[PDB]
Amino acid sequence: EKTHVQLSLPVLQVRDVLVRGFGDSVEEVLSEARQHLKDGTCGLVEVEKGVLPQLEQPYVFIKRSDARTAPHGHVMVELVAELEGIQYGRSGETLGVLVPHVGEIPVAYRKVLLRKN
């Protein structure tokens, strides 16, 4: 409905993640990421050296879409997928890579304002 939704995403350590991606195609991983975001079952892994090789492609990133500011502490973000070096969507700085959340203990929470498709 609303164009944006406030979410608090659990930040997960890459080596804890049990399900290392959302599926097998760009369209499936964006769809599954959106449904897990809706269901409150989406985690966030912050991207550092060595993180992406330990996750499964296609990747779904949340990237900063923002205008001038970030409402409250919630950065405005949108989804961008990546498969074999090609990205689908264009957006700003990467806040991290999304993965299914199945009970892993987070190290932090990231407050974001997720934009619609």
Side-chain angles (χ1 to χ4, degrees):
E1 205 282 289
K2 276 197 184 128
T3 72
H4 287 77
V5 294
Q6 296 192 7
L7 306 168
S8 285
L9 304 181
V11 181
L12 307 181
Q13 305 192 64
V14 67
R15 291 181 186 278
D16 286 339
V17 171
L18 298 175
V19 185
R20 294 186 170 276
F22 285 110
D24 302 339
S25 68
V26 165
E27 291 148 322
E28 177 178 29
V29 300
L30 289 165
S31 171
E32 284 292 327
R34 292 200 171 265
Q35 258 168 350
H36 280 79
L37 286 161
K38 289 190 188 288
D39 298 338
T41 52
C42 189
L44 179 63
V45 181
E46 296 183 311
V47 174
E48 307 284 356
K49 313 306 189 78
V51 168
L52 290 180
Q54 295 181 73
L55 296 177
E56 293 170 336
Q57 302 194 56
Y59 312 121
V60 175
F61 304 104
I62 47 151
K63 288 175 170 295
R64 185 170 204 190
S65 51
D66 71 325
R68 319 143 139 170
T69 77
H72 336 309
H74 296 66
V75 173
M76 275 183 290
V77 302
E78 54 203 337
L79 304 191
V80 172
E82 177 181 310
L83 178 57
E84 289 163 5
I86 291 174
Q87 293 201 334
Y88 298 81
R90 76 190 298 260
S91 188
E93 192 192 348
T94 297
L95 280 78
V97 54
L98 300 180
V99 294
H101 186 216
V102 295
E104 297 95 339
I105 304 304
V107 296
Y109 285 84
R110 194 63 202 253
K111 299 195 286 106
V112 309
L113 198 49
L114 171 68
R115 209 161 276 193
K116 56 143 184 115
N117 188 38

